């Protein structure tokens, strides 16, 4: 949120690199949501043949997704990252994870510096 | 009876006339020159006096080549009117097709006209029988001019229409229906095109010639109307062909078939597993999704409930499809029909025939006796 906002103050357009996944649903705006890698329900069933014609049909190039031996990552997404793209996590999963740590630190302070504490009601509370 | 090898569908008119003259000189009593709509529009059969010029199915033919609809029908009508005799030319064609009536309207009116439509009452032809089967479909035709008995056709409506159209030509020569017994036997001989099931007691095997999307769709519809339990199909696309043809073909195949196998029918220097991915993209799947699912033992089905399989090599996949079939179910091979050439890259191999299907149907007994499971693509091998 902070970043996208920041760009605005500078009048620089979002670059073309934002791109659709095999499921066209993925886009920076919709990806962080919890259901992941799942085509969104539009009522009418997505026109599968229509998508094909759009990307490449009769003539043209489509990133046909067939696995190959050579070590170039299949996701076009990986390009530009030295080793690989970051692993996928939802806002939800991340939030639970972030949460545990802060707590852990308080517990950590407790583990080493915390057996003794200023409060006099501590003995009952420690348990 | 013999047929000379010709590269094109319609040979040269002068060469065809020379061969017909050589045959009529010794070894043949009649020289009938029969050509399709494209051959008739090119000028192969046009430069020959045709005694009987009838159309089996009149529709939009050579629309992209000639540039105008009903061009082949008009050319055939003109060729028939060039050399026409009274009460000698036959106009037997389905009355439902308007191009057939348009072609029959042109030419000499003294020529005999007749209709082979089953639903039409003016044609007086009707099946009037319920004996449709994968092995033989006999009908009791009740017409004043047509013969009583009909030929056993593999298809429900296409073969029935062909038999009804041939009954008129058979009765024109001889009014007695006993002479059409040989024609009915030859029609039931299961020719290369729209072949019937094998005579051996096994699962039905139908070898068809379906490459264009519309023909594939109509053959799939006829098989669904004929197929009692399952519709198992296996086919592939040719290299350097219409790229937009693969996804629509895959969609039309998966829309009405429970389980389909996708292979490489004609690699022809095109990289494998590439056009296969193009066909897989029609149902929205990618070869990566399948391959990473293949490491497991689940293989999730399609959202509509159907199943889809694929394999690179053609022989093993065809043998599996012939083995993965129910008793009442029939296996359809629409990849190639009368063709006996598989061009895998620069070299071509002639390893596509019905003898392989017969060997597979013979050895499936030993496979079942060994304990192998051929219900789905991941065969359950004991230990």
Tab-separated table of C-alpha atoms in Angstrom:
chain	number	residue	atom	x	y	z
A	1	UNK	CA	0.000	0.000	0.000
A	2	UNK	CA	2.702	2.357	0.941
A	3	UNK	CA	4.653	1.827	-2.200
A	4	UNK	CA	1.933	2.023	-4.714
A	5	UNK	CA	0.894	5.191	-3.059
A	6	UNK	CA	4.369	6.525	-3.202
A	7	UNK	CA	4.705	6.108	-6.868
A	8	UNK	CA	1.802	8.372	-7.458
A	9	UNK	CA	3.379	11.432	-6.031
A	10	UNK	CA	5.865	10.974	-8.776
A	11	UNK	CA	3.814	10.604	-11.884
A	12	UNK	CA	5.451	7.396	-13.010
A	13	UNK	CA	3.205	4.799	-14.619
A	14	UNK	CA	3.095	1.246	-13.390
A	15	UNK	CA	5.338	-0.692	-15.730
A	16	UNK	CA	4.080	-3.377	-18.113
A	17	UNK	CA	5.718	-6.151	-16.109
A	18	UNK	CA	2.544	-6.634	-14.069
A	19	UNK	CA	1.127	-9.651	-15.816
A	20	UNK	CA	-1.619	-12.244	-15.779
A	21	UNK	CA	-1.004	-15.769	-14.575
A	22	UNK	CA	-2.032	-18.952	-16.344
A	23	UNK	CA	-5.240	-18.314	-14.491
A	24	UNK	CA	-5.791	-14.822	-15.850
A	25	UNK	CA	-7.213	-13.873	-12.480
A	26	UNK	CA	-3.882	-13.234	-10.915
A	27	UNK	CA	-2.951	-9.566	-10.957
A	28	UNK	CA	-1.337	-7.543	-8.216
A	29	UNK	CA	-4.757	-6.217	-7.227
A	30	UNK	CA	-6.390	-9.624	-6.743
A	31	UNK	CA	-3.605	-12.011	-5.823
A	32	UNK	CA	-3.129	-11.269	-2.127
A	33	UNK	CA	-6.615	-12.529	-1.370
A	34	UNK	CA	-6.922	-15.899	0.380
A	35	UNK	CA	-8.339	-18.204	-2.221
A	36	UNK	CA	-5.200	-18.712	-4.230
A	37	UNK	CA	-4.573	-19.596	-7.854
A	38	UNK	CA	-8.299	-20.032	-8.331
A	39	UNK	CA	-10.245	-18.637	-11.253
A	40	UNK	CA	-12.933	-16.265	-10.091
A	41	UNK	CA	-16.585	-17.132	-10.717
A	42	UNK	CA	-18.128	-14.836	-13.314
A	43	UNK	CA	-21.501	-16.493	-13.718
A	44	UNK	CA	-20.955	-17.474	-17.324
A	45	UNK	CA	-18.238	-20.079	-17.528
A	46	UNK	CA	-15.002	-18.601	-18.860
A	47	UNK	CA	-14.655	-19.104	-22.591
A	48	UNK	CA	-11.708	-21.346	-22.814
A	49	UNK	CA	-11.414	-21.238	-26.597
A	50	UNK	CA	-11.689	-17.485	-26.525
A	51	UNK	CA	-8.690	-17.145	-24.223
A	52	UNK	CA	-6.649	-19.282	-26.555
A	53	UNK	CA	-7.482	-17.300	-29.565
A	54	UNK	CA	-6.506	-14.148	-27.798
A	55	UNK	CA	-3.011	-15.172	-26.735
A	56	UNK	CA	-2.038	-16.961	-29.928
A	57	UNK	CA	-4.263	-18.594	-32.512
A	58	UNK	CA	-3.523	-19.594	-36.137
A	59	UNK	CA	-0.209	-17.743	-35.966
A	60	UNK	CA	1.644	-16.136	-33.081
A	61	UNK	CA	3.471	-16.867	-29.857
A	62	UNK	CA	2.054	-18.273	-26.657
A	63	UNK	CA	4.172	-19.424	-23.781
A	64	UNK	CA	3.085	-22.934	-24.187
A	65	UNK	CA	3.459	-24.339	-20.691
A	66	UNK	CA	5.218	-27.647	-21.387
A	67	UNK	CA	8.075	-28.614	-19.062
A	68	UNK	CA	11.563	-28.791	-20.575
A	69	UNK	CA	14.975	-30.031	-19.408
A	70	UNK	CA	16.851	-26.718	-19.753
A	71	UNK	CA	17.226	-24.607	-16.612
A	72	UNK	CA	15.289	-21.468	-17.498
A	73	UNK	CA	12.397	-20.977	-15.167
A	74	UNK	CA	8.955	-21.813	-16.686
A	75	UNK	CA	7.113	-19.008	-14.979
A	76	UNK	CA	7.819	-15.901	-16.927
A	77	UNK	CA	7.448	-14.411	-13.537
A	78	UNK	CA	10.806	-15.717	-12.355
A	79	UNK	CA	12.757	-13.800	-14.877
A	80	UNK	CA	14.921	-11.192	-13.196
A	81	UNK	CA	15.241	-12.898	-9.925
A	82	UNK	CA	18.591	-14.541	-9.565
A	83	UNK	CA	17.591	-17.837	-8.190
A	84	UNK	CA	13.726	-17.884	-8.080
A	85	UNK	CA	10.510	-15.846	-7.246
A	86	UNK	CA	9.450	-15.516	-3.684
A	87	UNK	CA	7.188	-18.320	-2.259
A	88	UNK	CA	3.458	-17.524	-2.256
A	89	UNK	CA	1.703	-16.496	0.927
A	90	UNK	CA	-1.683	-14.848	1.476
A	91	UNK	CA	-2.270	-11.767	3.554
A	92	UNK	CA	-3.896	-14.059	5.961
A	93	UNK	CA	-1.169	-16.546	6.357
A	94	UNK	CA	1.356	-13.805	6.632
A	95	UNK	CA	-0.610	-12.062	9.285
A	96	UNK	CA	-0.843	-15.069	11.463
A	97	UNK	CA	2.858	-15.567	11.019
A	98	UNK	CA	3.844	-12.054	11.825
A	99	UNK	CA	1.765	-12.255	14.876
A	100	UNK	CA	3.451	-15.187	16.339
A	101	UNK	CA	6.825	-13.595	16.319
A	102	UNK	CA	6.097	-10.469	18.269
A	103	UNK	CA	4.660	-12.691	20.814
A	104	UNK	CA	7.596	-14.975	20.673
A	105	UNK	CA	9.918	-12.104	21.460
A	106	UNK	CA	7.965	-11.213	24.537
A	107	UNK	CA	8.163	-14.866	25.437
A	108	UNK	CA	11.866	-14.792	24.630
A	109	UNK	CA	12.469	-11.874	26.940
A	110	UNK	CA	10.582	-13.938	29.433
A	111	UNK	CA	12.714	-16.970	28.783
A	112	UNK	CA	16.044	-15.346	29.523
A	113	UNK	CA	15.500	-12.003	31.239
A	114	UNK	CA	11.928	-12.613	32.334
A	115	UNK	CA	11.804	-15.151	35.159
A	116	UNK	CA	12.016	-12.178	37.501
A	117	UNK	CA	9.898	-9.085	36.831
A	118	UNK	CA	8.854	-5.861	38.591
A	119	UNK	CA	5.284	-6.901	39.446
A	120	UNK	CA	4.598	-8.474	42.849
A	121	UNK	CA	1.615	-10.468	41.555
A	122	UNK	CA	4.038	-12.236	39.249
A	123	UNK	CA	4.274	-15.654	40.922
A	124	UNK	CA	0.632	-16.491	40.221
A	125	UNK	CA	0.849	-14.800	36.831
A	126	UNK	CA	3.978	-16.616	35.680
A	127	UNK	CA	2.298	-19.955	35.644
B	1	UNK	CA	-11.340	-53.714	-59.070
B	2	UNK	CA	-7.714	-52.666	-58.573
B	3	UNK	CA	-6.834	-49.016	-57.958
B	4	UNK	CA	-3.640	-47.320	-59.109
B	5	UNK	CA	-1.610	-45.207	-56.702
B	6	UNK	CA	-2.153	-41.471	-57.192
B	7	UNK	CA	-0.647	-38.648	-55.090
B	8	UNK	CA	-3.502	-36.185	-55.540
B	9	UNK	CA	-7.127	-36.917	-54.694
B	10	UNK	CA	-8.130	-36.462	-58.352
B	11	UNK	CA	-5.636	-37.577	-61.038
B	12	UNK	CA	-5.134	-35.960	-64.438
B	13	UNK	CA	-8.154	-36.126	-66.733
B	14	UNK	CA	-6.103	-37.331	-69.708
B	15	UNK	CA	-4.325	-39.983	-67.632
B	16	UNK	CA	-7.646	-41.113	-66.141
B	17	UNK	CA	-9.161	-41.374	-69.624
B	18	UNK	CA	-6.149	-43.351	-70.861
B	19	UNK	CA	-6.390	-45.760	-67.919
B	20	UNK	CA	-10.139	-46.150	-68.476
B	21	UNK	CA	-9.563	-46.907	-72.163
B	22	UNK	CA	-6.833	-49.433	-71.333
B	23	UNK	CA	-9.161	-51.143	-68.855
B	24	UNK	CA	-12.156	-51.158	-71.215
B	25	UNK	CA	-9.961	-52.610	-73.975
B	26	UNK	CA	-9.295	-55.737	-71.895
B	27	UNK	CA	-10.170	-56.487	-68.270
B	28	UNK	CA	-13.136	-54.159	-67.675
B	29	UNK	CA	-16.623	-53.830	-69.151
B	30	UNK	CA	-17.398	-50.344	-67.788
B	31	UNK	CA	-15.284	-47.286	-66.962
B	32	UNK	CA	-17.057	-45.085	-64.399
B	33	UNK	CA	-15.198	-41.909	-63.399
B	34	UNK	CA	-16.238	-40.791	-59.906
B	35	UNK	CA	-14.816	-37.658	-58.284
B	36	UNK	CA	-15.651	-35.582	-55.220
B	37	UNK	CA	-16.871	-31.975	-55.210
B	38	UNK	CA	-13.335	-30.585	-55.471
B	39	UNK	CA	-12.429	-33.026	-58.238
B	40	UNK	CA	-15.593	-32.149	-60.151
B	41	UNK	CA	-14.958	-28.416	-59.754
B	42	UNK	CA	-11.328	-28.782	-60.861
B	43	UNK	CA	-12.251	-30.489	-64.132
B	44	UNK	CA	-11.337	-34.125	-63.537
B	45	UNK	CA	-14.799	-35.691	-63.841
B	46	UNK	CA	-16.198	-32.719	-65.787
B	47	UNK	CA	-14.420	-33.766	-69.005
B	48	UNK	CA	-16.264	-37.094	-69.205
B	49	UNK	CA	-19.758	-38.108	-70.306
B	50	UNK	CA	-21.489	-39.158	-67.078
B	51	UNK	CA	-24.433	-41.533	-67.439
B	52	UNK	CA	-25.607	-41.001	-63.839
B	53	UNK	CA	-24.571	-37.938	-61.801
B	54	UNK	CA	-26.082	-38.033	-58.304
B	55	UNK	CA	-24.925	-36.302	-55.122
B	56	UNK	CA	-24.796	-38.173	-51.818
B	57	UNK	CA	-24.784	-34.993	-49.705
B	58	UNK	CA	-25.157	-31.500	-51.172
B	59	UNK	CA	-23.836	-28.668	-48.996
B	60	UNK	CA	-21.320	-25.808	-49.011
B	61	UNK	CA	-18.288	-27.437	-50.645
B	62	UNK	CA	-15.058	-25.674	-51.658
B	63	UNK	CA	-16.380	-22.371	-50.317
B	64	UNK	CA	-12.874	-21.088	-49.556
B	65	UNK	CA	-11.383	-22.382	-52.822
B	66	UNK	CA	-14.084	-21.518	-55.364
B	67	UNK	CA	-15.051	-18.385	-53.424
B	68	UNK	CA	-18.812	-18.919	-53.760
B	69	UNK	CA	-21.325	-21.336	-52.274
B	70	UNK	CA	-22.989	-24.018	-54.422
B	71	UNK	CA	-20.146	-23.743	-56.950
B	72	UNK	CA	-19.331	-27.464	-56.951
B	73	UNK	CA	-23.025	-28.347	-57.235
B	74	UNK	CA	-23.415	-25.960	-60.178
B	75	UNK	CA	-20.326	-27.435	-61.852
B	76	UNK	CA	-21.673	-30.968	-61.380
B	77	UNK	CA	-25.060	-29.934	-62.780
B	78	UNK	CA	-23.384	-28.342	-65.807
B	79	UNK	CA	-21.243	-31.439	-66.393
B	80	UNK	CA	-24.360	-33.616	-66.184
B	81	UNK	CA	-26.279	-31.342	-68.568
B	82	UNK	CA	-23.400	-31.385	-71.072
B	83	UNK	CA	-23.859	-35.135	-71.660
B	84	UNK	CA	-27.388	-36.109	-70.585
B	85	UNK	CA	-29.764	-38.789	-71.861
B	86	UNK	CA	-33.533	-39.166	-71.358
B	87	UNK	CA	-34.478	-41.396	-68.404
B	88	UNK	CA	-30.798	-42.331	-67.965
B	89	UNK	CA	-29.452	-39.763	-65.480
B	90	UNK	CA	-30.326	-40.192	-61.804
B	91	UNK	CA	-30.857	-37.275	-59.408
B	92	UNK	CA	-30.983	-39.328	-56.202
B	93	UNK	CA	-30.146	-36.952	-53.345
B	94	UNK	CA	-31.467	-35.972	-49.924
B	95	UNK	CA	-34.470	-33.663	-50.248
B	96	UNK	CA	-33.531	-31.861	-47.020
B	97	UNK	CA	-30.503	-30.274	-48.703
B	98	UNK	CA	-31.422	-27.167	-50.742
B	99	UNK	CA	-28.278	-27.449	-52.880
B	100	UNK	CA	-29.475	-30.873	-54.048
B	101	UNK	CA	-32.779	-29.413	-55.254
B	102	UNK	CA	-30.937	-26.486	-56.855
B	103	UNK	CA	-28.687	-28.900	-58.760
B	104	UNK	CA	-31.638	-31.089	-59.766
B	105	UNK	CA	-33.490	-28.034	-61.093
B	106	UNK	CA	-30.679	-27.351	-63.570
B	107	UNK	CA	-30.001	-29.569	-66.559
B	108	UNK	CA	-32.289	-31.558	-68.795
B	109	UNK	CA	-35.723	-32.100	-67.187
B	110	UNK	CA	-36.242	-35.393	-69.054
B	111	UNK	CA	-33.665	-37.077	-66.777
B	112	UNK	CA	-35.169	-39.232	-63.992
B	113	UNK	CA	-35.385	-37.493	-60.613
B	114	UNK	CA	-35.870	-39.159	-57.226
B	115	UNK	CA	-35.287	-38.406	-53.544
B	116	UNK	CA	-33.611	-40.631	-50.948
B	117	UNK	CA	-34.790	-38.769	-47.838
B	118	UNK	CA	-36.137	-40.909	-44.999
B	119	UNK	CA	-38.319	-38.367	-43.174
B	120	UNK	CA	-39.797	-36.957	-46.390
B	121	UNK	CA	-43.021	-38.635	-47.489
B	122	UNK	CA	-42.555	-37.748	-51.168
B	123	UNK	CA	-39.373	-39.840	-51.317
B	124	UNK	CA	-41.420	-42.830	-50.022
B	125	UNK	CA	-38.238	-44.239	-48.406
B	126	UNK	CA	-38.172	-44.956	-44.672
B	127	UNK	CA	-36.155	-47.225	-42.354
B	128	UNK	CA	-39.227	-48.655	-40.586
B	129	UNK	CA	-36.975	-50.841	-38.438
B	130	UNK	CA	-35.092	-50.742	-35.122
B	131	UNK	CA	-31.913	-52.820	-35.452
B	132	UNK	CA	-29.114	-50.275	-34.996
B	133	UNK	CA	-25.908	-51.801	-33.636
B	134	UNK	CA	-22.147	-51.386	-33.820
B	135	UNK	CA	-21.805	-54.641	-35.788
B	136	UNK	CA	-24.755	-54.399	-38.197
B	137	UNK	CA	-27.706	-52.014	-38.606
B	138	UNK	CA	-30.272	-53.648	-40.896
B	139	UNK	CA	-33.354	-51.694	-41.976
B	140	UNK	CA	-36.513	-52.806	-43.786
B	141	UNK	CA	-36.917	-50.145	-46.463
B	142	UNK	CA	-40.520	-49.865	-47.687
B	143	UNK	CA	-40.502	-47.906	-50.952
B	144	UNK	CA	-42.078	-48.506	-54.371
B	145	UNK	CA	-38.836	-48.015	-56.318
B	146	UNK	CA	-36.292	-48.800	-53.608
B	147	UNK	CA	-35.370	-52.315	-52.566
B	148	UNK	CA	-36.903	-54.003	-49.534
B	149	UNK	CA	-33.746	-54.946	-47.631
B	150	UNK	CA	-31.137	-52.330	-46.736
B	151	UNK	CA	-27.403	-52.454	-46.068
B	152	UNK	CA	-25.875	-52.778	-42.604
B	153	UNK	CA	-24.201	-49.452	-41.815
B	154	UNK	CA	-21.825	-48.646	-38.976
B	155	UNK	CA	-23.146	-45.104	-38.494
B	156	UNK	CA	-26.625	-44.219	-37.298
B	157	UNK	CA	-27.649	-41.619	-39.889
B	158	UNK	CA	-24.662	-41.130	-42.213
B	159	UNK	CA	-24.322	-44.811	-43.125
B	160	UNK	CA	-28.115	-45.126	-43.306
B	161	UNK	CA	-28.244	-42.163	-45.692
B	162	UNK	CA	-25.468	-43.685	-47.811
B	163	UNK	CA	-27.319	-47.013	-47.967
B	164	UNK	CA	-30.549	-45.228	-48.916
B	165	UNK	CA	-28.745	-43.308	-51.667
B	166	UNK	CA	-27.120	-46.495	-52.992
B	167	UNK	CA	-30.412	-48.426	-52.933
B	168	UNK	CA	-31.732	-46.155	-55.689
B	169	UNK	CA	-28.726	-46.818	-57.935
B	170	UNK	CA	-29.009	-50.536	-57.190
B	171	UNK	CA	-32.712	-50.647	-58.051
B	172	UNK	CA	-32.269	-48.562	-61.215
B	173	UNK	CA	-30.342	-51.418	-62.840
B	174	UNK	CA	-32.419	-54.241	-61.367
B	175	UNK	CA	-35.895	-53.982	-59.842
B	176	UNK	CA	-35.368	-57.231	-57.901
B	177	UNK	CA	-34.040	-56.759	-54.377
B	178	UNK	CA	-32.053	-60.016	-54.495
B	179	UNK	CA	-29.356	-58.347	-56.615
B	180	UNK	CA	-28.646	-55.801	-53.844
B	181	UNK	CA	-27.442	-58.569	-51.510
B	182	UNK	CA	-23.868	-58.225	-52.781
B	183	UNK	CA	-24.021	-54.449	-52.366
B	184	UNK	CA	-25.343	-54.793	-48.819
B	185	UNK	CA	-22.566	-57.276	-48.032
B	186	UNK	CA	-19.931	-54.929	-49.461
B	187	UNK	CA	-21.344	-52.015	-47.458
B	188	UNK	CA	-21.198	-54.128	-44.277
B	189	UNK	CA	-17.584	-55.107	-45.065
B	190	UNK	CA	-16.449	-52.233	-42.784
B	191	UNK	CA	-14.371	-50.150	-45.245
B	192	UNK	CA	-11.594	-47.757	-44.267
B	193	UNK	CA	-13.883	-44.760	-43.820
B	194	UNK	CA	-16.212	-44.926	-40.789
B	195	UNK	CA	-15.171	-48.501	-40.080
B	196	UNK	CA	-17.328	-50.722	-37.880
B	197	UNK	CA	-16.271	-52.898	-34.941
B	198	UNK	CA	-14.079	-55.962	-35.354
B	199	UNK	CA	-15.656	-59.375	-35.888
B	200	UNK	CA	-13.839	-60.770	-32.839
B	201	UNK	CA	-15.771	-60.876	-29.565
B	202	UNK	CA	-14.300	-57.824	-27.824
B	203	UNK	CA	-14.906	-54.124	-27.230
B	204	UNK	CA	-16.118	-52.103	-30.190
B	205	UNK	CA	-13.427	-50.336	-32.214
B	206	UNK	CA	-14.378	-47.622	-34.717
B	207	UNK	CA	-11.636	-46.229	-36.968
B	208	UNK	CA	-12.755	-42.921	-38.485
B	209	UNK	CA	-11.198	-40.145	-40.571
B	210	UNK	CA	-11.847	-36.868	-38.719
B	211	UNK	CA	-9.478	-33.902	-39.080
B	212	UNK	CA	-11.664	-30.837	-39.619
B	213	UNK	CA	-13.579	-29.528	-36.574
B	214	UNK	CA	-17.057	-29.826	-38.112
B	215	UNK	CA	-16.561	-33.402	-39.331
B	216	UNK	CA	-15.048	-34.386	-35.982
B	217	UNK	CA	-18.017	-32.826	-34.179
B	218	UNK	CA	-20.628	-34.562	-36.335
B	219	UNK	CA	-18.839	-37.911	-36.013
B	220	UNK	CA	-18.664	-37.430	-32.238
B	221	UNK	CA	-22.395	-36.666	-32.178
B	222	UNK	CA	-23.174	-39.775	-34.235
B	223	UNK	CA	-21.003	-41.891	-31.923
B	224	UNK	CA	-22.724	-40.425	-28.849
B	225	UNK	CA	-26.057	-41.337	-30.439
B	226	UNK	CA	-24.664	-44.823	-31.115
B	227	UNK	CA	-22.433	-45.280	-28.061
B	228	UNK	CA	-24.464	-47.023	-25.363
B	229	UNK	CA	-22.219	-46.493	-22.329
B	230	UNK	CA	-18.943	-44.658	-23.022
B	231	UNK	CA	-17.312	-42.600	-25.777
B	232	UNK	CA	-13.547	-43.227	-25.729
B	233	UNK	CA	-11.584	-41.260	-28.328
B	234	UNK	CA	-7.903	-40.753	-29.134
B	235	UNK	CA	-6.540	-38.300	-31.700
B	236	UNK	CA	-3.848	-35.726	-32.373
B	237	UNK	CA	-2.951	-32.680	-34.430
B	238	UNK	CA	-0.537	-32.275	-37.327
B	239	UNK	CA	2.499	-30.022	-37.234
B	240	UNK	CA	2.636	-26.662	-39.019
B	241	UNK	CA	-1.161	-26.842	-39.325
B	242	UNK	CA	-3.942	-24.459	-38.280
B	243	UNK	CA	-2.985	-23.427	-34.748
B	244	UNK	CA	-6.541	-22.328	-33.945
B	245	UNK	CA	-7.866	-25.758	-34.930
B	246	UNK	CA	-6.301	-27.585	-31.970
B	247	UNK	CA	-8.129	-25.795	-29.099
B	248	UNK	CA	-11.573	-25.930	-30.722
B	249	UNK	CA	-11.021	-29.603	-31.576
B	250	UNK	CA	-9.994	-30.380	-27.994
B	251	UNK	CA	-13.011	-28.481	-26.651
B	252	UNK	CA	-15.480	-30.221	-28.972
B	253	UNK	CA	-13.924	-33.563	-28.021
B	254	UNK	CA	-13.974	-33.006	-24.253
B	255	UNK	CA	-17.488	-31.525	-24.295
B	256	UNK	CA	-19.214	-34.818	-25.162
B	257	UNK	CA	-16.645	-37.543	-24.358
B	258	UNK	CA	-16.178	-39.008	-20.888
B	259	UNK	CA	-12.518	-39.997	-21.375
B	260	UNK	CA	-10.269	-38.767	-24.190
B	261	UNK	CA	-6.602	-39.401	-25.002
B	262	UNK	CA	-4.487	-36.728	-26.703
B	263	UNK	CA	-1.446	-37.781	-28.734
B	264	UNK	CA	0.767	-36.574	-31.602
B	265	UNK	CA	-0.935	-37.774	-34.781
B	266	UNK	CA	1.602	-36.153	-37.140
B	267	UNK	CA	4.738	-34.563	-35.655
B	268	UNK	CA	6.239	-33.712	-39.094
B	269	UNK	CA	9.355	-31.914	-37.801
B	270	UNK	CA	7.309	-30.012	-35.213
B	271	UNK	CA	8.499	-30.398	-31.638
B	272	UNK	CA	6.427	-32.881	-29.596
B	273	UNK	CA	4.807	-31.954	-26.282
B	274	UNK	CA	4.254	-28.511	-27.843
B	275	UNK	CA	1.085	-28.987	-29.895
B	276	UNK	CA	0.011	-31.372	-27.127
B	277	UNK	CA	0.243	-28.443	-24.711
B	278	UNK	CA	-1.790	-26.432	-27.227
B	279	UNK	CA	-4.555	-29.046	-27.089
B	280	UNK	CA	-4.312	-29.163	-23.288
B	281	UNK	CA	-4.730	-25.378	-23.097
B	282	UNK	CA	-8.217	-25.789	-24.569
B	283	UNK	CA	-9.592	-27.236	-21.326
B	284	UNK	CA	-7.536	-24.663	-19.438
B	285	UNK	CA	-4.925	-27.165	-18.245
B	286	UNK	CA	-1.179	-26.906	-18.778
B	287	UNK	CA	1.272	-29.762	-19.252
B	288	UNK	CA	2.917	-28.629	-16.034
B	289	UNK	CA	-0.307	-29.081	-14.074
B	290	UNK	CA	-0.706	-32.582	-15.423
B	291	UNK	CA	2.923	-33.604	-14.952
B	292	UNK	CA	3.032	-32.423	-11.334
B	293	UNK	CA	-0.249	-34.268	-10.750
B	294	UNK	CA	1.234	-37.387	-12.354
B	295	UNK	CA	3.814	-37.607	-9.576
B	296	UNK	CA	0.807	-38.298	-7.340
B	297	UNK	CA	-1.890	-40.948	-7.834
B	298	UNK	CA	-5.005	-38.740	-7.951
B	299	UNK	CA	-5.364	-37.236	-11.461
B	300	UNK	CA	-8.294	-34.904	-10.743
B	301	UNK	CA	-11.037	-34.943	-13.390
B	302	UNK	CA	-12.539	-32.103	-15.414
B	303	UNK	CA	-15.048	-29.690	-13.837
B	304	UNK	CA	-17.849	-31.164	-15.968
B	305	UNK	CA	-17.096	-34.656	-14.620
B	306	UNK	CA	-15.288	-36.010	-17.687
B	307	UNK	CA	-11.705	-37.291	-17.804
B	308	UNK	CA	-8.751	-36.428	-20.036
B	309	UNK	CA	-5.557	-38.401	-20.658
B	310	UNK	CA	-2.528	-37.866	-22.876
B	311	UNK	CA	0.633	-39.624	-24.014
B	312	UNK	CA	3.496	-38.821	-26.368
B	313	UNK	CA	3.836	-42.065	-28.333
B	314	UNK	CA	0.886	-43.120	-30.479
B	315	UNK	CA	1.198	-46.918	-30.352
B	316	UNK	CA	1.138	-47.390	-26.571
B	317	UNK	CA	-1.657	-44.848	-26.110
B	318	UNK	CA	-3.767	-46.425	-28.864
B	319	UNK	CA	-3.250	-49.890	-27.377
B	320	UNK	CA	-4.251	-48.565	-23.952
B	321	UNK	CA	-7.376	-46.903	-25.361
B	322	UNK	CA	-8.289	-50.165	-27.093
B	323	UNK	CA	-7.697	-51.957	-23.781
B	324	UNK	CA	-9.397	-49.296	-21.613
B	325	UNK	CA	-12.934	-50.005	-22.761
B	326	UNK	CA	-16.164	-51.479	-21.418
B	327	UNK	CA	-18.199	-54.270	-22.996
B	328	UNK	CA	-21.083	-52.102	-24.193
B	329	UNK	CA	-18.697	-49.198	-24.765
B	330	UNK	CA	-16.935	-48.636	-28.089
B	331	UNK	CA	-13.514	-47.083	-28.724
B	332	UNK	CA	-13.303	-44.486	-31.508
B	333	UNK	CA	-10.024	-43.665	-33.255
B	334	UNK	CA	-10.606	-40.427	-35.178
B	335	UNK	CA	-6.919	-39.620	-35.662
B	336	UNK	CA	-6.564	-41.418	-38.991
B	337	UNK	CA	-8.773	-43.632	-41.123
B	338	UNK	CA	-7.636	-45.130	-44.422
B	339	UNK	CA	-4.277	-43.358	-44.041
B	340	UNK	CA	-1.306	-45.619	-43.265
B	341	UNK	CA	1.505	-43.100	-42.787
B	342	UNK	CA	2.868	-41.520	-39.596
B	343	UNK	CA	5.492	-38.842	-40.275
B	344	UNK	CA	7.365	-38.443	-36.974
B	345	UNK	CA	9.863	-35.719	-37.824
B	346	UNK	CA	11.770	-36.004	-41.096
B	347	UNK	CA	11.135	-39.748	-41.478
B	348	UNK	CA	7.733	-41.402	-41.863
B	349	UNK	CA	6.638	-44.747	-40.414
B	350	UNK	CA	3.741	-46.860	-41.697
B	351	UNK	CA	2.739	-48.260	-38.308
B	352	UNK	CA	-0.902	-47.090	-38.174
B	353	UNK	CA	-3.445	-49.773	-39.081
B	354	UNK	CA	-6.257	-51.898	-37.661
B	355	UNK	CA	-4.016	-54.956	-37.238
B	356	UNK	CA	-2.488	-53.278	-34.182
B	357	UNK	CA	-5.969	-52.816	-32.711
B	358	UNK	CA	-6.759	-56.468	-33.444
B	359	UNK	CA	-3.550	-57.583	-31.718
B	360	UNK	CA	-4.384	-55.381	-28.724
B	361	UNK	CA	-7.921	-56.778	-28.494
B	362	UNK	CA	-6.457	-60.290	-28.691
B	363	UNK	CA	-3.816	-59.685	-26.001
B	364	UNK	CA	-6.139	-57.823	-23.614
B	365	UNK	CA	-7.324	-61.274	-22.518
B	366	UNK	CA	-3.785	-62.195	-21.468
B	367	UNK	CA	-3.400	-58.771	-19.837
B	368	UNK	CA	-6.533	-59.322	-17.745
B	369	UNK	CA	-5.386	-62.858	-16.907
B	370	UNK	CA	-2.060	-61.447	-15.691
B	371	UNK	CA	-3.906	-59.132	-13.290
B	372	UNK	CA	-3.119	-55.746	-14.846
B	373	UNK	CA	-5.726	-53.019	-14.343
B	374	UNK	CA	-6.652	-51.031	-17.464
B	375	UNK	CA	-9.527	-48.999	-16.009
B	376	UNK	CA	-7.722	-45.635	-16.161
B	377	UNK	CA	-4.434	-44.214	-17.422
B	378	UNK	CA	-2.416	-45.050	-14.246
B	379	UNK	CA	-2.406	-48.835	-14.639
B	380	UNK	CA	-2.247	-50.494	-11.215
B	381	UNK	CA	0.728	-52.830	-11.582
B	382	UNK	CA	0.908	-55.628	-8.973
B	383	UNK	CA	4.028	-54.965	-6.876
